[PDB]
A paper describes a structure:
Encapsulins are a prevalent protein‐based compartmentalization strategy in prokaryotes. Family 2, the most abundant class of encapsulins, is further subdivided into Family 2A and Family 2B based on the absence or presence, respectively, of a putative cyclic nucleotide binding domain (CBD) inserted into the E‐loop of the HK97 fold encapsulin shell protein. In this work, we report the characterization of a Family 2B two‐component encapsulin shell identified in Streptomyces lydicus (Sl). Through heterologous expression and purification studies, we show the differential assembly behavior of the two shell components – Sl‐Enc1 and Sl‐Enc2 – and demonstrate their ability to co‐assemble into mixed shells with variable shell composition.
In contrast, Sl‐Enc2 formed characteristic ca. 28 nm shells, consistent with other T = 1 Family 2B encapsulins. That is to say, the Sl‐Enc1 majority sample yielded a symmetry‐averaged Sl‐Enc1 shell map while the Sl‐Enc2 majority sample resulted in a symmetry‐averaged Sl‐Enc2 shell density. Sl‐Enc2 can assemble into complete shells by itself. Therefore, we used the symmetry‐averaged Sl‐Enc2 map to build a model for a complete homogeneous Sl‐Enc2 shell. The Sl‐Enc2 shell is 28 nm in diameter, consists of 60 identical protomers, and exhibits T = 1 icosahedral symmetry, similar to recently described Family 2B encapsulins. Overall, the homogeneous Sl‐Enc2 shell is similar to recently structurally characterized Family 2B encapsulins with externally displayed CBDs being positioned above all two‐fold pores. The two‐fold pores are large and elongated with dimensions of 14 by 60 Å and partially occluded by the CBDs. The absence of any resolvable N‐arms in the homogeneous Sl‐Enc2 shell contributes to the large dimensions of these pores. Two additional types of pores are present in the Sl‐Enc2 shell at the five‐ and three‐fold axes of symmetry with diameters of 6 and 3 Å, respectively. Symmetrical Sl‐Enc2 or mixed interactions never exhibited resolved N‐arms in our 3D classes.
Author numbering: 44 to 69, 254 to 471
The structure:
């Protein structure tokens, strides 16, 4: 279990028919199809019958599986090669640091490549390496407030931890800066609510059936995707040398 900041900060756009069209002006519009995170919830019939007195274990297992699905959605929206944010950045929007460690000069270059940068995402180990560079230069950044929470910030831009961002064996990671919202032509999240059997908005549970053994099976499905409206809404600092 982790703090899924990406799901909390991304706005969500309603999609009809499971498909979304974005006009590209460098040709043909790019089409986004919703992806699915599915799991089968298996419960023995004895548990569903007898173990409901202190707490309904059928609902307890349902919440446990839903949390696992949310963790997988967070992982896919960053690392997926089709629609992940680490692979859908324009080549002009990818920059490298002057030296190994992530210095305050590198952060200023990252936020100067687009208008109205709204959030920074980095691995918790990367955030620790950023703080060490601050201390060596004797600067103490103030901080910001986001969604009722107090978080760290740089030039007023909140910096949020995310453990889904990979760390290479050679102790390198990446930092992500993005603009948000459809009205700002930023990054948006794609989902479709109103599906027939909604346990949660955009999430469905179906009875499926019972097999030869007294095991009840359920199908849990969540549909999601992500899109970048304009190329200059996302930026990556590629090779940040953490660990020294």
């Amino acid at each position: 279990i982790s703090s899924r900041w990406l799901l909390r900060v991304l706005p969500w756009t309603q999609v009809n028919g499971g498909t979304y069209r974005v006009n590209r002006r460098l040709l043909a519009p790019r089409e986004y199809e919703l992806s699915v995170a599915q799991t089968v919830l298996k419960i023995h019939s004895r548990v569903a019958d007898l173990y409901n007195d202190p707490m309904n274990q059928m609902d307890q297992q349902l919440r446990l599986t839903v949390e696992a699905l949310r963790e997988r959605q967070e992982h896919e929206m960053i690392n997926n090669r089709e629609f992940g944010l680490l692979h859908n950045a324009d080549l002009k929007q990818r920059i490298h640091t002057r030296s190994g460690p992530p210095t305050p000069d590198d952060l200023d270059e990252l936020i100067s490549r687009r208008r109205k940068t709204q959030v920074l995402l980095a691995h918790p180990r990367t955030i620790a390496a950023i703080g060490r560079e601050w201390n060596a230069r004797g600067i103490y950044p103030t901080g910001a407030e986001l969604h009722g929470t107090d978080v760290r910030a740089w030039r007023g831009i909140p910096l949020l931890p995310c453990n889904k961002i990979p760390v290479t064996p050679e102790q390198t990671s990446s930092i992500i800066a993005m603009r948000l919202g459809e009205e700002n032509q930023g990054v948006v999240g794609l989902h479709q609510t109103g599906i027939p059997d909604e346990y949660q908005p955009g999430l469905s549970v179906r009875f499926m059936g019972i097999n030869d053994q007294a095991v009840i099976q359920y199908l849990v499905s969540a549909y999601y995707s992500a899109a970048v409206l304009v190329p200059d809404a996302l930026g990556i600092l590629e090779d940040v040398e953490i660990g020294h």
